[PDB]
Write a protein that binds this ligand. Structure first.
Ligand SMILES: *C[C@@H](O)COP(=O)(O)O
Ligand SMILES: *C[C@@H](O)COP(=O)(O)O
Lengths: 249, 249
């Protein structure tokens, strides 16, 4: 009775046209035989290449970030611009944007709200730091991040939201969360959604895990009842993303 | 004895594929009969479209921003990625990135240095605020911004630099700097470069003006001896950019 899983590739700031062409061919040649939404999020400048080359019908293309409106915002890409070029998925609130690039809960929440209004599917990232984990604040943090986002959404908007629980200490560090750690958080998130948003919304909501997912640990994560797939960084640059997808069977 | 002028279009966060196709056709059909480097800086996601459609031999394509290195920087585009896709011009330090997106003098200077090391032509933006202007700090500000950049450059690197003097109060406000205001600043910048970098470097350096340039005011700006062309925002989205280019004759 889980909702449809998602296997999402966050390529981050990586790729050449040669490397992308090779990896997209790998993705194309991998026949997927279960119901899963695959997502690839290239850098902005690589979106047209991926749109030209990616043909696997289980995939959609996502942006890694956006701003809400067009205008005098040198260097940024807006949601209307993405929609016009055919991109209607976006990752918002990823941790280094929160950490490095000043995206507060309020800024993330506003972005998510705008994206939903413009018809995007949104992968909204939440997660605690190592300091917060060791201070026994994990629940408080992820619920605060989630409630900030929720405050700007209507109930219907949640049909467009995907949460990605990504402990900051697991991102790129080779220190994956255990299945029990991840399940604990996904369960408490889903219960919050059930009680604060709706029981229907909670049952349908995809809550993905991210942070050092690889092809060897993914199936055991996916076996937990409240884990609906993955947001994958480093391993999504490699052919083993195929087995991460198949770990959602 | 001016160096080769530049007419640069900063499209900012604007465009659809239909609007871009139409404007690029206008640019293509405009025959330019003098020595000028034209530059168009689309949003990242529009770079491939512009590369596919733009054919006027006086043009090159620029990014509106970049980060120095590839890696775990969700949402950002790096200098190596741009180089690989054929983009070897970049605008750095534009005012709302300084104001809105936390680019300090140190961050701008580091970006400019990295870009030069990677073989980019760089349009490095400097300029004072209205508050700084009214406090009689214009010179101090633009020289501080310039010297910060200079501190991370070798002499040879300056062959890749273009300065864009853009008073913040003139950006998008319909309040262009007068020719005398702009010339005063360009003269003091060039003298600083001459004395601190080299007399040869100063003679060859393009110092562009930006901030509410349009087709009607451009020629009178260009007539000033230390103005080498323009960084154009709003008017570069319109067919009248053709006459801004021709104002550098
Ligand atoms: C969610 C994403 O940032 C995790 O990156 P990994 O390299 O998969 O840890
Ligand atoms: C340099 C650039 O920001 C100026 O924009 P305008 O719209 O031309 O004032």
């Amino acid at each position: 009775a889980k909702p449809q899983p998602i296997a999402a590739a966050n390529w981050k700031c990586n790729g050449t046209t040669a490397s992308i062409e090779k990896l997209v061919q790998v993705f194309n040649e991998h026949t997927i035989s279960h119901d899963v939404q695959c997502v690839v999020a290239p850098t902005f400048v690589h979106i047209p290449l991926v749109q030209a080359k990616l043909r696997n019908p289980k995939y959609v293309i996502s942006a890694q970030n956006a701003i809400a409106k067009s205008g005098a915002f040198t260097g940024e890409v807006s949601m209307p611009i993405l929609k016009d070029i055919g991109v209607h998925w976006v990752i918002l609130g990823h941790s280094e944007r929160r950490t490095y690039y000043g995206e507060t809960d309020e800024i993330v929440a506003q972005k998510v709200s705008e994206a939903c209004k413009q018809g995007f599917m949104v992968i909204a990232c939440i997660g605690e730091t190592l300091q917060q984990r060791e201070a026994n604040q994990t629940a408080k943090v992820v619920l605060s991040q989630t409630s900030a986002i929720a405050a700007k959404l209507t109930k219907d908007a949640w049909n467009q939201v995907v949460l990605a629980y990504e402990p900051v200490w697991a991102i790129g560090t080779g220190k994956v969360a255990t299945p029990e750690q991840a399940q604990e958080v996904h369960l408490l998130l889903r219960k919050w959604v059930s009680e604060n948003i709706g029981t229907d919304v909670a049952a349908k909501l995809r809550i993905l895990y991210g942070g050092s997912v690889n092809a060897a640990n993914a199936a055991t994560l996916y076996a937990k009842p409240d884990i609906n797939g993955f947001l994958v960084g480093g391993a999504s640059l490699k052919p083993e993303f195929r087995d991460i997808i198949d770990a959602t069977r």
